[PDB]
Amino acid sequence: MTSRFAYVTCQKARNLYLEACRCLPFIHRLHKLEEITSLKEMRLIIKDKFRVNSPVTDSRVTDLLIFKGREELETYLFMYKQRHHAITEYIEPYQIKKLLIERKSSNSAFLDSFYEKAYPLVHSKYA
Amino acid sequence: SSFLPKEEVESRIIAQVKEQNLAAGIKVELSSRFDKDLGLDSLDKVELLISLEEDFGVEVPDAEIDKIHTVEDAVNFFISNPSS
Amino acid sequence: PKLVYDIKYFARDYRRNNSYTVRSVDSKTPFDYSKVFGSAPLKPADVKTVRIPEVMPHRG
Amino acid sequence: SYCYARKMTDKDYIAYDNIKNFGDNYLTDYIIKTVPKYVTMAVNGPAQSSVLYQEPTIYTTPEHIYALCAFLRDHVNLQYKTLIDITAVDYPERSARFEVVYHLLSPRLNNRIRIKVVVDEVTSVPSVSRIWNAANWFERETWDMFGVFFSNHPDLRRVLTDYGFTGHPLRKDFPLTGYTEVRYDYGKKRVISEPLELTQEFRYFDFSSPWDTLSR
Amino acid sequence: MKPLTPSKVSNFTINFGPQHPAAHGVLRLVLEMDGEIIKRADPHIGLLHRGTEKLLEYKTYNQGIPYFDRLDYVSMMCMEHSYVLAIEQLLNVAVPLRGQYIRVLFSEITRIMNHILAITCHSMDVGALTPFLWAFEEREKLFEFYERVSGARMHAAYFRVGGVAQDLPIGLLRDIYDWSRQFASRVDEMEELLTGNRIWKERTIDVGLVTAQQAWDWGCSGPILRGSGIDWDLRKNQPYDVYGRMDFNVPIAGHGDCYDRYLVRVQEMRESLRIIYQCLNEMPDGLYKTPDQKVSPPSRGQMKQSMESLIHHFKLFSEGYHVPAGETYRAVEAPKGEFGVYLVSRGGNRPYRCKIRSPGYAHLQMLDMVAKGAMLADVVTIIGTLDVVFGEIDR
Amino acid sequence: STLKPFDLNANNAVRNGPGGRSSIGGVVATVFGANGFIGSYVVNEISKRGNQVVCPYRCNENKVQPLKQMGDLGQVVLLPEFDIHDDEYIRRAISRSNVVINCVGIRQETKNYSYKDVHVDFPTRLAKIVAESGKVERFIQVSEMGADVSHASRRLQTKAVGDEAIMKYIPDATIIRPGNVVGIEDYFYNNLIFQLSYTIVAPVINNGANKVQPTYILDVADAVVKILKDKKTSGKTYYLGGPETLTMRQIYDHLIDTLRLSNDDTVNLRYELAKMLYKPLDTLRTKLPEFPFLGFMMSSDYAEEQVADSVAPAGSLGYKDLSISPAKVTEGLAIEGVRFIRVGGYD
Amino acid sequence: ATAPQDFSLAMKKADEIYSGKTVKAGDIGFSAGVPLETY
Amino acid sequence: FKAVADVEIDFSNRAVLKKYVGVDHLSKEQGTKAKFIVSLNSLLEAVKSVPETAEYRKAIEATCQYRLKVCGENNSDAAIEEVLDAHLEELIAESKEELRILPVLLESKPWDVPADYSAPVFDYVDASTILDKK
Ligand SMILES: NC(=O)C1=CN([C@@H]2O[C@H](COP(=O)(O)OP(=O)(O)OC[C@H]3O[C@@H](n4cnc5c(N)ncnc54)[C@H](OP(=O)(O)O)[C@@H]3O)[C@@H](O)[C@H]2O)C=CC1
Ligand SMILES: CCCCCCCCCCCC(=O)SCCNC(=O)CCNC(=O)[C@H](O)C(C)(C)COP(=O)(O)O
- Asked if H1 contacts E252 with a C-beta cutoff of 8 angstroms, the reply is yes
A88 closest CA partner among A35, A124, A36: A36
CA–CA separation, F100 vs F224, rounded Å?
Answer: 12
Q: Nearest Cα to D166, choosing from A53, A82, E45? A: A53
Flag whether E342 is in a domain. Answer: yes
Distance CA F22, CA D176 (A): 19
Q: Is CATH 3.30.460.80 the right assignment for the domain spanning D17-151?
A: yes
Residue F248, strand partner residues: none
- C18 contacts H124 by C-beta, under 8 angstroms: yes
Helix (H) or strand (E) holding H77: helix H77-84
Query: The domain spanning residue E230 has which CATH number?
Result: 1.10.645.10
Inter-chain contact D193–A88, Cβ cutoff 8 Å?
yes
Q: E287 burial class (0-12, 13-18, 19+ CB within 10 angstroms)?
A: buried
CA E118 remoteness from chain centre: 11
Q: C-alpha distances in angstroms, A95 versus A37, A41, E40, E159, F328?
A: 9, 9, 39, 57, 12
Contact between A37 and F337 (Cβ < 8 Å): no
Residue D103 backbone phi and psi in degrees, to 5? -115, 125
Residues 6+ apart with CB under 8 A from B15: none
The reply to whether E115 falls in a domain is yes
What value, to the nearest 5°, has the Cα angle with vertex F174 and ends F168 and F179?
A: 115
Chain C environment of G17 (Cβ under 8 Å): none
Contact between C23 and H121 using a beta-carbon 8 Å cutoff: yes
**Is the shortest distance between the CB of F146 and ligand 1 below 6 Å?**
no
Exposure of D112 by Cβ count < 10 A (0-12 exposed, 13-18 middle, 19+ buried)? buried
d(C-alpha E276, C-alpha E282), whole Å? 10
**C-alpha torsion sign, points F18, F21, F24, F27:** positive
Residue type, A59: S
CATH number at residue F61: 3.40.50.720
- Which helix (H) or strand (E) segment holds residue D104: the answer is strand D98-106
- Interchain pair G20, D40: CB under 8 A: no
Q: Does a structural domain hold residue F107?
A: yes
Task: Give the C-alpha separation, E296 to E96, whole Å.
Answer: 12
Tell me if E24 is assigned to some domain.
no
Method: cryo-EM
D19 touches chain H (CB under 8 A): yes
Ligand 2 centre distance from Cα of residue D123 (Å)? 20
Among the partner-chain residues C15, C52, C59, the one whose CB lies closest to the CB of E324 is C15
Q: Does E240 touch chain C (CB under 8 A)?
A: yes
Distance in angstroms (rounded) separating the CA atoms of residues E297 and F249: 82
Find the A69 Cα to ligand 2 centroid distance in Å. 8
CB E395 within 8 A of CB E52: yes
H or E segment and range at residue F203: strand F202-205
Secondary structure letter of residue B38 according to DSSP: S
Question: CA–CA separation, C34 vs C40, rounded Å?
Answer: 10
Query: What is the number of residues in chain D?
Result: 216
* Cβ pair E346:D216 closer than 8 A: yes
On whether residue E27 sits in a domain, the answer given is no
Q: Which residues does chain G have within 8 Å of residue E324's beta carbon, measured at their own beta carbons? A: 6-7
CA distance D215 to D206: 14
E238 to chain D, any CB pair closer than 8 A? The answer is: yes
Residue type (1 letter), E115: H
DSSP A4-15: TTT---TTHHHH
**CA-to-CA distance for F137 and E86, rounded, in angstroms?**
64
Distance of CA A59 to the CA centre of its chain: 21
Q: Which of B37, B41, B62, B73 is catalytic?
A: B41
Mutate to test the interface with E, among D82, D89, D94 (most CBs of E within 10 A): D82
* F266 part of a folded domain: no
Kindly state whether residue E270 falls inside one of the protein's structural domains: yes
Q: Distance, in angstroms, between E300 CA and closest chain H CA?
A: 30
Q: Which helix (H) or strand (E) holds D174?
A: none
Could you say which of D15, D29, D77 has the minimum Cβ distance to residue C50? D15
Known catalytic membership, residue B41: yes
- D-chain CB neighbours of G10 within 8 Å are 41, 43
Are the C-beta atoms of residues E349 and E256 closer than 8 Å to each other? Answer: no
- Residue A99 to residue F23, Cβ atoms within 8 A: no
Say how far apart CA D5 and CA E228 lie, in whole Å.
Answer: 10
The alpha carbon torsion through H64, H70, H75, H77 (nearest 10 deg) reads -70
Distance CA E262, CA E201 (A): 11
For chain F, how many structural domains are there in total?
Answer: 1
Residue in G with minimal Cα distance to C17:
G6
- Integer angstrom CA distances of residue B7 from B13, B17, B29, E203: 10, 15, 12, 73
Q: Which amino acid is at D58?
A: I
Q: After which residues is chain A broken (C to N over 2.5 A)?
A: 8
Chain F residues closer than 8 Å to A36 by CB: 332-333, 336
User: Residue A86: which H helix or E strand, with range?
Assistant: helix A83-86
Under 8 Å CB pairs connecting chains C and D tally to: 62
Q: Distance (Å, rounded) from C-alpha D108 to C-alpha D3?
A: 7
Q: How many Å apart are CA D191 and CA F346, to the nearest integer?
A: 25
Q: Which ligand is nearest to the CA of F126?
A: 1
Three-class DSSP labels, chain E? CCCCCCCCCCEEEEEECCCCCCCCCCCEEEEEEECCEEEEEEEECCCCCCCHHHHHCCCCCHHHHHHHHHHCCCCHHHHHHHHHHHHHHHHCCCCCHHHHHHHHHHHHHHHHHHHHHHHHHHHHHHCCCHHHHHHHHHHHHHHHHHHHHHCCCCCCCCEECCEECCCCCCCHHHHHHHHHHHHHHHHHHHHHHHCCCHHHHHHHCCCCCCCHHHHHHHCCCCHHHHCCCECCCHHHHCCCCHHHCCCCCCEECCCCCHHHHHHHHHHHHHHHHHHHHHHHHHCCCCCCECCCCCCCCCCHHHHHHCHHHHHHHHHHHHCCCCCCCEEEEEEEEECCEEEEEEEEECCCCCCCEEEEECHHHHHHHHHHHHCCCCECCHHHHHHHHHCCCHHHHCC
d(CA F284, CA H80): 104
Residue type, D137: W
CA D128 vs CA D49, D133, E30, E216, E363: distances in Å: 23, 8, 25, 15, 18
DSSP class of residue F16 equals B
Print the domain residue range for E303.
44-393
CA angle E2, E4, E6 (to 5 degrees): 165
Q: How many angstroms from the chain centroid is the CA of residue H36?
A: 11
Q: What is the spatial distance between Cα C25 and Cα E271, in angstroms, rounded to a whole number?
A: 47
Instruction: Count CA within 13 A, CB hemisphere, residue F18.
Output: 17
Task: With respect to residue E373, please indicate whether it lies within any of the assigned structural domains.
Answer: yes
Q: Which amino acid is at B57?
A: G
Question: In the complex, which subunits touch D with 3 or more CB pairs below 8 angstroms?
Answer: A, C, E, F, G, H
Query: Residue D189: which of F268, F185, E289 has the closest Cα?
Result: F185
Q: How far apart are CA A111 and CA A75, in angstroms?
A: 42
Q: Where are the alpha helices (DSSP H) in chain B?
A: 6-19, 42-55, 62-67, 71-80
F178 lines ligand 1 (CB under 6 A): yes
Which of these, B54, B44, D189, lies nearest to A28 by C-alpha position? B54
- E324 has a chain G CB within 8 A of its CB: yes
CA–CA min distance A104, chain G (Å)? 25
Query: Residue H113: helix, strand or coil by DSSP?
Result: coil
Cα Rg of chain A, angstroms: 22
Q: Give the neighbor-by-neighbor strand order of the sheet with D111-119.
A: C19-25, H119-125, D39-46, D54-60, D111-119, D98-106, D82-90
F65 burial class (0-12, 13-18, 19+ CB within 10 angstroms)? Answer: exposed
DSSP string, F263-322: S--EEEE-TTTHHHHSHHHHHHHHTS---SSS-SSSSHHHHHHTSS-B---SS-B-TTTT
- Chains G and F in direct contact, meaning 3 or more beta-carbon pairs closer than 8 angstroms: no
Instruction: Compute, in angstroms, the gap from residue F341 CA to the centroid of ligand 2.
Output: 40
Residue F334 DSSP label: G
**Residue E18 forms part of a structural domain:** no
Comparing CA positions, the residue from D119, D121, D137 lying closest to residue D129 is D137
- CA-CA distance, E63 to E6, in Å (whole number)? 63
Using the beta-carbon criterion (under 8 Å), do G9 and H122 form an inter-chain contact?
yes
DSSP state of F177: -
Residue E98 CB burial class (10 angstroms; 0-12, 13-18, ≥19): buried
d(CA F44, CA F53): 9
Expressed in angstroms, the distance from the first to the final Cα of chain G is 36
Angle between helices E378-386 and E258-282 (to 10 degrees): 30
Amino acid at C21: T
Count of alpha carbons within 13 Å of A15, Cβ hemisphere only?
12
Please check whether residue G35 touches A, CB under 8 A: no
Q: Which residues contact D96 (CB under 8 A, 6 or more apart)?
A: D118, D119, D120, G18, G19, G20
F35 lines ligand 1 (CB under 6 A): yes
Query: Is residue F237 one of the residues assigned to a domain?
Result: yes
H8, exposed or middle or buried, with CB in 10 Å at 0-12, 13-18, 19+? exposed
SS3 letters across E150-173: HCCCCCCCCEECCEECCCCCCCHH
Closest CA to F145 of F155, F132, F133: F155
**Which chain C residues contact residue G3 at CB under 8 A?**
none
Domain that holds residue F67: 11-246+307-341
H with C: touching (≥3 Cβ pairs within 8 Å): yes
